[PDB]
Amino acid sequence: PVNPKPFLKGLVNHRVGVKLKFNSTEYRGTLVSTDNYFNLQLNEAEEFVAGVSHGTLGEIFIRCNNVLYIREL
Amino acid sequence: MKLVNFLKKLRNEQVTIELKNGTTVWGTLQSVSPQMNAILTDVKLTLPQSNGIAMASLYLTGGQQNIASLQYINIRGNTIRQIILPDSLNLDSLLVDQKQLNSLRRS
Amino acid sequence: MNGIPVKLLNEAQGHIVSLELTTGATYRGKLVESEDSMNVQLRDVIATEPQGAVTHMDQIFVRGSQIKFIVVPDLLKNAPLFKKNSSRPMPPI
Amino acid sequence: SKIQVAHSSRLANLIDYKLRVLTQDGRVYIGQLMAFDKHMNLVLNECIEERVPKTQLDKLRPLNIKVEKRVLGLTILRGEQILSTVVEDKPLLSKKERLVRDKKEKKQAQKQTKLRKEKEK
Amino acid sequence: RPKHELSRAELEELEEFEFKHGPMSLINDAMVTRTPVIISLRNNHKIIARVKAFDRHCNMVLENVKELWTEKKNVINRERFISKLFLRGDSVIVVLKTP
Amino acid sequence: KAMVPPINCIFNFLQQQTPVTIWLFEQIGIRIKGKIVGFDEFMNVVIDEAVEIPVNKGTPLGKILLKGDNITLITSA
Amino acid sequence: MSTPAAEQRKLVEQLMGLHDPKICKSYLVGECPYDLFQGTKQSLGKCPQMHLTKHKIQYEREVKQGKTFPEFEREYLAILSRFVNECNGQISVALQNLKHTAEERMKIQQVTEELDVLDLISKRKEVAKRVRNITENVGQSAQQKLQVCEVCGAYLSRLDTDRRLADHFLGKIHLGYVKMREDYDRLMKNNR
Amino acid sequence: RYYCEYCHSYLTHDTLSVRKSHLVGKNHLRITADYYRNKARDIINKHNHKRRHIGKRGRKERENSSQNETLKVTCLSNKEKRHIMHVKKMNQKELAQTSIDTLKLLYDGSPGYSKVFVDANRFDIGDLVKASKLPQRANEKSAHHSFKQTSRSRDETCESNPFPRLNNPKKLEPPKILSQWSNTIPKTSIFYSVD
Amino acid sequence: MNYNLSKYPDDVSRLFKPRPPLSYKRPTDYPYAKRQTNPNITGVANLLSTSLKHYMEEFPEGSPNNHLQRYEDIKLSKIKNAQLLDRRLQNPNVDPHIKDTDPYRTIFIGRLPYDLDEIELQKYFVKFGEIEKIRIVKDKITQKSKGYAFIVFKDPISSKMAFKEIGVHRGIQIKDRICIVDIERG
Amino acid sequence: VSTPELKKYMDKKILLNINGSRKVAGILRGYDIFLNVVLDDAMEINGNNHQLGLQTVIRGNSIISLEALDAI
RNA sequence: UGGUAUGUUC
RNA sequence: AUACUUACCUUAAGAUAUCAGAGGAGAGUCCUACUGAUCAAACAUGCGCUUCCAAUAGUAGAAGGACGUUAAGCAUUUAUCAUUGAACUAUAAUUGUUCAUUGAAGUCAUUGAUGCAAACUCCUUGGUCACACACACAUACGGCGCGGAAGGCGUG
């Protein structure tokens, strides 16, 4: 019924979370823009190493090479 | 807007290349493919402080007698991690991007 | 387009070749039918796992990206693909 | 190894040289290239594959090193799991002899085209 | 829209439009305001440097590179100052821009 | 019977809305359980009601756009 | 395409009421004749109506349990009847060409000249002349030795062995036309 | 587009169904087999001799070698050396093509002859024999041979042919000898053999 | 090794006796179950806290980009040239040379010769209808013939027929050139 | 570009290997130009047994080779 | 506007 | 070899080095046997240039190997789990000890594998070249013979 491109254009301006492949880097922030190669741009992101935080980051560009999934809270 | 054409303007430049295996390669550039398959001459390569696969790749190239001195090495694109240019070269004149200037003039 | 090595791999069809995989398992058998994407099919396959043991498959089909190399027989040392100045007898219109 | 590899040569000029090509594992293949492509898939004549064992690696870490050599003959190696290639040994016949051989191949190819034109008539 | 059926020789204009108004807004802001960015790489080589050029493969030219990694045996931090660098987009995990 | 291509296999798997077990990469990766709602040509599969269980205490995850390069295997639980 | 990712994108874009003229009813029921003759020498060109896989899956799910539509079946029956009439006209033209080749002017003149000289001892001479005329007729028929295929209307041979004939029967034209004949016979058995 | 380097024939846009059918047809088989045979014959027949290195020999070697003896050189005419080298080439090719086939005809009445030596009921390579029959799509290739097939099935047991001497066997072949050294055979046998 | 599926004869197969099987030894790399990059990569928030304060203190100012400045100067020069072209093109009722009669009988002949005269143009225009006025347009900065003229005839139908006869036969052959005629397009 | 020649594996039991040990034995129902494999009645084999649902689809990136368990 | 391969007759 | 039938297919595009100026064609584009500069290729050509080219006034030796021998050389390390029975150390899916029934795969290799070290033998390569068996050198060595192999630089 749905496709990842209308779901991902509608995912803009939401507190989303992105897990990486390494199980020690998870970035949770507000999505700004996303291209057709699915590169991610976030704002006021937070680092999550194995669940626990380390500090706020801000405007950040997450490459689609190292993403595993993106979630909606 | 591929920056391999920036490296095509870097002939006879005495650079270093850190590979993804971990090897630092000091040598002069001769040519580079558009797929970034770069050939180098007057080369010495060194694995710093380990990775036993990188030590095997360092020794099994002939000319070891851990700085290995080799005459001519071609390097594949996906094994290049980063390349360090000499600081005496001016980046403001080599990055003029004449193909991008012609594409902007064609618009 | 295709290139010389994929034409050489398509040349030695129906011959005893030996593959090595990326994991370390070495296969050896008769090539059934090679493709341009190097997804090659072998028959009477003898296999050596990276653990060391030796087994025998009847009909294997390996994907081209998980191949380290493949050994063709030596009589393909002299091939017309290796000729540099072979002219072309009047291609059709 | 005092070979003095050419200073401005590429893969079209390095053909029929006894290469010593390195891979990601370090499984070094020694042999003559006879063809390549865009993905750098190299055929290797009289090729040998050499490695070092895990016990020899401790001695290699800072002398003699006992490498393990297997014989592959004429193989065809892919360009994905390779890292670097160098020129180890020069071929048998020289540049002038290869030039005379290439002129003989061109004259033989022109004679073959004249024979095809004679058979077409 | 499919990529092969857009047009011929006008894909560079769409690539520049995606550069100005897409995920490339941070690499564009760093090269015009000369702010230092922190690129974390796939082998713990964190780079603090200024961006000089942009590429489709995210091949980035960096000037006044201060790179830092951590050796875990025991725990030491080793840094290096490199004047000019051409970084491949394969190694890049993430790019952070400071305000 | 006939041939069932993988795109139509995932399309029928989408229509039936069976319970889904999606595997991933090795020991770092974590097996996910959910229900498929969307996919594309690069196999970026969108799943809902996701509970993750590591390789041999599951936690809810919500709605997930799982990318293609880590997807290994899809089963109907 | 040169890349397979564009091929997969094309498959997604062509895979993702229902009584509309845009949907090919012969493909919605199944085995469209414009699909079974796509790239062969007997090609009809291109189907003007669009083909879809999601509509075919919905029609299969409806015909599994829900219901059936007789209008698309009647349209497919009319299309199969028109194509079978065109193929029967082509087979009749091939049979007329074979009958004209068997009844050529010089061949009938040679047969009449052989039969004019065909007329105990006289009965044995007439039997030998009839055997010679049969040998001449067999030599005249062996110059082509082309039969007529009873189903697909192509040309066959009697002296040809069964392996080349089995290679002939496994084509796109013959499989498609046998499937169309099976569908036409099923619809004529259901209607009558 | 596709070009066969062997048959020197072109093709349309590169279809796998056409290229697969091209390597099965008989003309490509003949040209490919003849080309491989001629290239193997050329790389065997190429006498790549070593480049000679003649040095100024020692004095005492010259006083020793020029006083011992002078040997005689034998040499033949053109047709003689041509006929001898042609006989040597046919002998080399008939030795390269031959093989010892004594175990196949020596265990012919064995109870497991139909399970190993028949080469069609073999387990590991019998599917390769049963797969490519060369199905003879020409009627003349099937109508040419009019002899029996004598296909021995696997299900032949020990009940069939119980006594191997009543069912008429063949006397085994004698050990073949070299025809150039056939004049030194003992002309007198040990025992009297009849017929 | 003894019996083959191969379509080649036995004389080819004796030449195709393959290499002996490869002598297997123990591998050196990690297996593909263990092939991965490094885990537990820490976050970049520690560099923005302590290392950024030492990094900004050593280089408070960045290097200027001469290539980006040259590209921006080229874009600004192109924008200024486009603005000057728009101001020159945006700024037929405020022209004294175009103060003739209505354009229904006023045709325009363009790409004419630079050394032509008004008498030959009037003789060419009066062949297919009576001409009321003729005016050759020139540049204001220099007194050179640009090759354009406007001829207003007495009737619109005769002027339209003259323009069709002059533009249908690949341009009217005016004595050194082929000048086509069309509407004034006012 | 080219469709892989898996026509001989149409109604036969195959055994995929996944990345060094995950041996999924199933019945090949369909494939693509990406070597994505559709298996009916899958079964995980470990050196123990584990069932993998009725139907499954397996990504061609993790697929290395496949053994034809059934005779052709 | 064509190509590749195969089977009959002269 | 001609004549005919059948099976499959009938094509991703654009271009051929770069920069500056002048002229022509109705801000943008094209052309110049148009002009200057850079670069690439080919053919010649020279730089007291760089490296190598094996005794014969002997029965040798340089480079690369043996997938050759002594050599089964010398020194080390392993050669399956579970249930139960007669005793049992015992936190285990009785692990440890002696014997056995049964259950799933079950590398061959222990004359095996790794490390160490010497000797002998045999293969492919060369200028196995022209004169002579000679007293030079702090500006360390008259590189001022005929060539060949590899390479650098410069000119047309």
Curated annotation (Swiss-Prot), chain A:
Range of residues in the leader sequence: none
Which cysteine pairs are joined by S-S bonds?
A: none
Superkingdom classification of source = Eukaryota
Subcellular localization: Nucleus; Cytoplasm
Task: Give a GO biological-process term.
Answer: 7-methylguanosine cap hypermethylation
- Keyword terms, alphabetized: Cytoplasm, mRNA processing, mRNA splicing, Nucleus, Ribonucleoprotein, RNA-binding, Spliceosome
GO terms for CC?
catalytic step 2 spliceosome; commitment complex; cytoplasm; nucleus; pICln-Sm protein complex; Prp19 complex; spliceosomal complex; U1 snRNP
Is Phosphoprotein there in the keyword field? no
* GO molecular function annotations of the record: poly(U) RNA binding; RNA binding; splicing factor binding
Q: Which residues form the Sm domain?
A: 3-73
Any idea what job this protein has? Plays a role in pre-mRNA splicing as a core component of the spliceosomal U1, U2, U4 and U5 small nuclear ribonucleoproteins (snRNPs), the building blocks of the spliceosome.
Q: Which family does it belong to?
A: Belongs to the snRNP Sm proteins family. SmF/LSm6 subfamily.
Quote additional remarks. Answer: Present with 2570 molecules/cell in log phase SD medium.
Subunit and interaction comment: Component of the Sm core complex, present in spliceosomal snRNP U1, U2, U4/U6 and U5. The core complex contains SMB1, SMD1, SMD2, SMD3, SME1, SMX3 and SMX2 (Sm proteins B, D1, D2, D3, E, F and G, respectively), and is probably a heptameric ring structure. SMX3 specifically interacts with SME1.
Which protein, by its recorded name, is this?
A: Small nuclear ribonucleoprotein F
Which organism does this sequence originate in? Saccharomyces cerevisiae (strain ATCC 204508 / S288c)
Gene name of the encoded protein: SMX3
Swiss-Prot record, chain C:
The organism sits in which domain of life? Answer: Eukaryota
Q: Where in the cell is it found?
A: Cytoplasm, Cytosol; Nucleus
CDD domains linked: Sm_D3
**Keyword Lyase tagged:** no
Q: Where is the Sm domain?
A: 4-76
- Check the record and name the InterPro entries matching this protein: LSm4/Sm_D1/D3, LSM_dom_sf, Sm, Sm_dom_euk/arc, SmD3
Q: Which GO molecular-function terms appear in the entry?
A: mRNA binding; RNA binding
Question: A single GO BP annotation from the record?
Answer: mRNA splicing, via spliceosome
Cellular component (GO) terms are: catalytic step 2 spliceosome; commitment complex; cytoplasm; cytosol; nucleus; precatalytic spliceosome; Prp19 complex; SMN-Sm protein complex
Q: Which UniProt keywords apply?
A: Cytoplasm, mRNA processing, mRNA splicing, Nucleus, Ribonucleoprotein, RNA-binding
Location (main, coarse): cytoplasm
Q: Which family does it belong to?
A: Belongs to the snRNP core protein family.
Subunit-structure text: Component of the Sm core complex, present in spliceosomal snRNP U1, U2, U4/U6 and U5. The core complex contains SMB1, SMD1, SMD2, SMD3, SME1, SMX3 and SMX2 (Sm proteins B, D1, D2, D3, E, F and G, respectively), and is probably a heptameric ring structure. SMD3 specifically interacts with SMB1.
What PANTHER family has UniProt attached to this entry?
SMALL NUCLEAR RIBONUCLEOPROTEIN SM
- What this chain does, per the record? Plays a role in pre-mRNA splicing as a core component of the spliceosomal U1, U2, U4 and U5 small nuclear ribonucleoproteins (snRNPs), the building blocks of the spliceosome. Also binds telomerase RNA and is required for its accumulation.
Q: What is this protein called?
A: Small nuclear ribonucleoprotein Sm D3
The gene is SMD3
UniProtKB/Swiss-Prot annotation, chain F:
What biological processes does GO assign it? 7-methylguanosine cap hypermethylation; mRNA 5'-splice site recognition; mRNA splicing, via spliceosome; spliceosomal complex assembly; spliceosomal snRNP assembly; U2-type prespliceosome assembly
Localization (cell): Cytoplasm; Nucleus
Chief subcellular site? cytoplasm
Query: What InterPro entries does the record point to?
Result: LSM_dom_sf, Sm, Sm_dom_euk/arc, snRNP-E
Q: Where is the Sm domain?
A: 7-77
One Gene Ontology MF term: splicing factor binding
Q: Which domain of life is it from?
A: Eukaryota
SMART domains in the record: Sm
Q: Which Pfam families match?
A: LSM (PF01423)
Gene Ontology terms: cellular component: commitment complex; cytoplasm; nucleus; pICln-Sm protein complex; precatalytic spliceosome; spliceosomal complex; U1 snRNP; U2 snRNP
* Keyword vocabulary terms for this entry: Cytoplasm, mRNA processing, mRNA splicing, Nucleus, Ribonucleoprotein, RNA-binding, Spliceosome
SUPFAM superfamilies in UniProt? Sm-like ribonucleoproteins (SSF50182)
The Swiss-Prot or TrEMBL record describes its family as follows: Belongs to the snRNP Sm proteins family.
Q: What else is known?
A: Present with 556 molecules/cell in log phase SD medium.
Subunit field text: Component of the Sm core complex, present in spliceosomal snRNP U1, U2, U4/U6 and U5. The core complex contains SMB1, SMD1, SMD2, SMD3, SME1, SMX3 and SMX2 (Sm proteins B, D1, D2, D3, E, F and G, respectively), and is probably a heptameric ring structure. SME1 specifically interacts with SMX2 and SMX3. Component of the U4/U6-U5 tri-snRNP complex composed of the U4, U6 and U5 snRNAs and at least PRP3, PRP4, PRP6, PRP8, PRP18, PRP31, PRP38, SNU13, SNU23, SNU66, SNU114, SPP381, SMB1, SMD1, SMD2, SMD3, SMX2, SMX3, LSM2, LSM3, LSM4, LSM5, LSM6, LSM7, LSM8, BRR2 and DIB1.
Curated annotation (Swiss-Prot), chain I:
| Record's keyword terms, sorted | mRNA processing, mRNA splicing, Nucleus, Ribonucleoprotein, RNA-binding, Spliceosome
Indicate yes or no for the key word Isomerase: no
List the GO terms this entry assigns under cellular component, sorted alphabetically: commitment complex; nucleus; spliceosomal complex; U1 snRNP; U2-type prespliceosome
Resulting phenotype, residue 150 to L: No splicing defects. Associates with U1 snRNP
**Which BP terms in the Gene Ontology apply to this protein?**
mRNA 5'-splice site recognition; mRNA splicing, via spliceosome
Q: Which GO terms describe its molecular function?
A: mRNA binding; U1 snRNA binding
Tell me the compartments it is located in: Nucleus
Where does the protein principally reside? nucleus
Residue ranges annotated for the RRM domain, each copy included: 105-186
The miscellaneous remark of the record is: Present with 736 molecules/cell in log phase SD medium.
**What is the role of the protein in this entry?**
Involved in nuclear mRNA splicing.
How it assembles, according to the record, is: Component of the spliceosome, where it is associated with snRNP U1. Binds stem loop I of U1 snRNA. Interacts with mRNA.
Protein name according to UniProt: U1 small nuclear ribonucleoprotein 70 kDa homolog
